[PDB]
Design a protein around this motif. Structure first.
Motif, PDB file in Angstrom:
ATOM      1  N   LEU A   1      -1.499   4.648  -7.132  1.00 58.70           N
ATOM      2  CA  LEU A   1      -2.444   3.540  -7.352  1.00 58.70           C
ATOM      3  C   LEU A   1      -3.208   3.144  -6.092  1.00 58.70           C
ATOM      4  O   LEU A   1      -3.841   2.098  -6.042  1.00 58.70           O
ATOM      5  CB  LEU A   1      -1.660   2.306  -7.876  1.00 58.70           C
ATOM      6  CG  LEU A   1      -1.135   2.469  -9.320  1.00 58.70           C
ATOM      7  CD1 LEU A   1      -0.213   1.351  -9.557  1.00 58.70           C
ATOM      8  CD2 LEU A   1      -2.256   2.485 -10.251  1.00 58.70           C
TER       9      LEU A   1
ATOM     10  N   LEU B   1       0.823  -1.197   0.000  1.00 68.69           N
ATOM     11  CA  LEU B   1       0.000   0.000   0.000  1.00 68.69           C
ATOM     12  C   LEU B   1       0.879   1.278   0.000  1.00 68.69           C
ATOM     13  O   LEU B   1       0.521   2.269  -0.638  1.00 68.69           O
ATOM     14  CB  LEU B   1      -0.967   0.009   1.212  1.00 68.69           C
ATOM     15  CG  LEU B   1      -1.883   1.251   1.337  1.00 68.69           C
ATOM     16  CD1 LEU B   1      -2.737   1.518   0.101  1.00 68.69           C
ATOM     17  CD2 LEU B   1      -2.836   0.967   2.596  1.00 68.69           C
ATOM     18  N   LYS B   2       1.979   1.259   0.737  1.00 71.50           N
ATOM     19  CA  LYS B   2       2.919   2.389   0.780  1.00 71.50           C
ATOM     20  C   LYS B   2       3.371   2.679  -0.665  1.00 71.50           C
ATOM     21  O   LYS B   2       3.389   3.840  -1.105  1.00 71.50           O
ATOM     22  CB  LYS B   2       4.163   2.063   1.624  1.00 71.50           C
ATOM     23  CG  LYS B   2       5.169   3.227   1.624  1.00 71.50           C
ATOM     24  CD  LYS B   2       6.461   2.863   2.379  1.00 71.50           C
ATOM     25  CE  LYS B   2       6.193   2.493   3.795  1.00 71.50           C
ATOM     26  NZ  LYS B   2       7.532   1.988   4.433  1.00 71.50           N
ATOM     27  N   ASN B   3       3.728   1.616  -1.377  1.00 70.95           N
ATOM     28  CA  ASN B   3       4.213   1.762  -2.766  1.00 70.95           C
ATOM     29  C   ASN B   3       3.097   2.206  -3.700  1.00 70.95           C
ATOM     30  O   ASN B   3       3.332   2.980  -4.637  1.00 70.95           O
ATOM     31  CB  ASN B   3       4.856   0.472  -3.248  1.00 70.95           C
ATOM     32  CG  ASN B   3       6.177   0.191  -2.570  1.00 70.95           C
ATOM     33  OD1 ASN B   3       6.555  -0.966  -2.383  1.00 70.95           O
ATOM     34  ND2 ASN B   3       6.895   1.248  -2.204  1.00 70.95           N
ATOM     35  N   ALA B   4       1.867   1.754  -3.424  1.00 71.11           N
ATOM     36  CA  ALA B   4       0.702   2.209  -4.226  1.00 71.11           C
ATOM     37  C   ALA B   4       0.492   3.698  -4.076  1.00 71.11           C
ATOM     38  O   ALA B   4       0.247   4.400  -5.044  1.00 71.11           O
ATOM     39  CB  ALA B   4      -0.531   1.455  -3.870  1.00 71.11           C
ATOM     40  N   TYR B   5       0.626   4.203  -2.840  1.00 74.27           N
ATOM     41  CA  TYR B   5       0.529   5.656  -2.657  1.00 74.27           C
ATOM     42  C   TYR B   5       1.637   6.393  -3.470  1.00 74.27           C
ATOM     43  O   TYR B   5       1.382   7.396  -4.141  1.00 74.27           O
ATOM     44  CB  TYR B   5       0.647   6.023  -1.180  1.00 74.27           C
ATOM     45  CG  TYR B   5      -0.672   5.972  -0.384  1.00 74.27           C
ATOM     46  CD1 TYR B   5      -1.579   7.013  -0.454  1.00 74.27           C
ATOM     47  CD2 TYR B   5      -0.913   4.942   0.540  1.00 74.27           C
ATOM     48  CE1 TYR B   5      -2.753   7.015   0.281  1.00 74.27           C
ATOM     49  CE2 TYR B   5      -2.086   4.926   1.302  1.00 74.27           C
ATOM     50  CZ  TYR B   5      -2.999   5.953   1.173  1.00 74.27           C
ATOM     51  OH  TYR B   5      -4.139   5.971   1.919  1.00 74.27           O
TER      52      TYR B   5
END
Lengths: 101, 98
Positions: free
Chosen positions: B27, B19-23
């Motif tokens: 995404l 989720l950190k990487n999606a932010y």
């Protein structure tokens, strides 16, 4: 009236407020304690398991039996996870295939 | 089993990292739609208001039930979670939510 667009937008703005709160917690390194406050231990475990379900549905090698007996994912959950993947924007699916596999 | 315990922990952190990487990649919105049901997302938006009103300390238990549909168990879960949270989180939430 049978459908309230006003309430739908109000719910949406409450959800965006959570999304923004968590965005800012990641920026400030408070994401882990925020997530512990906002999610129960069972909800957190469910999310960890859902990441593996999405990963396996994307890989498409695990059998229904292996999905059930390794991740607790029955035909109901598999179907729901599939429909979600179908509804997702291609940019997300592609990114997930990169990152998860 | 400390082994299984550590396995479940790495599974949770993998989600947190994802989720950190999606932010970072913008995404997060579609990721959260994939990972949470509509009812779970609504519950989270309501939980933010529960936390806000608990910290504000103005609404009574009855008013929390009336306004937010939050019953006694839910309010108690919120109160217990604020008591269990690190002080820095509580202090930040007071800044951002109030």
């Amino acid at each position: 009236s049978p459908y309230s667009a006003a309430m739908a937008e109000q719910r949406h703005q409450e959800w965006l407020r959570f999304v923004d709160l968590l965005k800012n917690a990641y920026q400030n390194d408070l994401h882990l304690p925020l997530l512990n406050l906002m999610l129960t231990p069972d909800e957190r475990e469910a999310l960890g398991t859902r990441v593996r379900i999405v990963e396996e549905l994307l890989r498409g090698e695990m059998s229904q039996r292996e999905l059930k007996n390794e991740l607790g994912a029955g035909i109901a959950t598999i179907t729901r996870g599939s429909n979600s993947l179908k509804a997702a924007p291609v940019e997300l699916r592609q990114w997930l295939e990169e990152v998860l596999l």
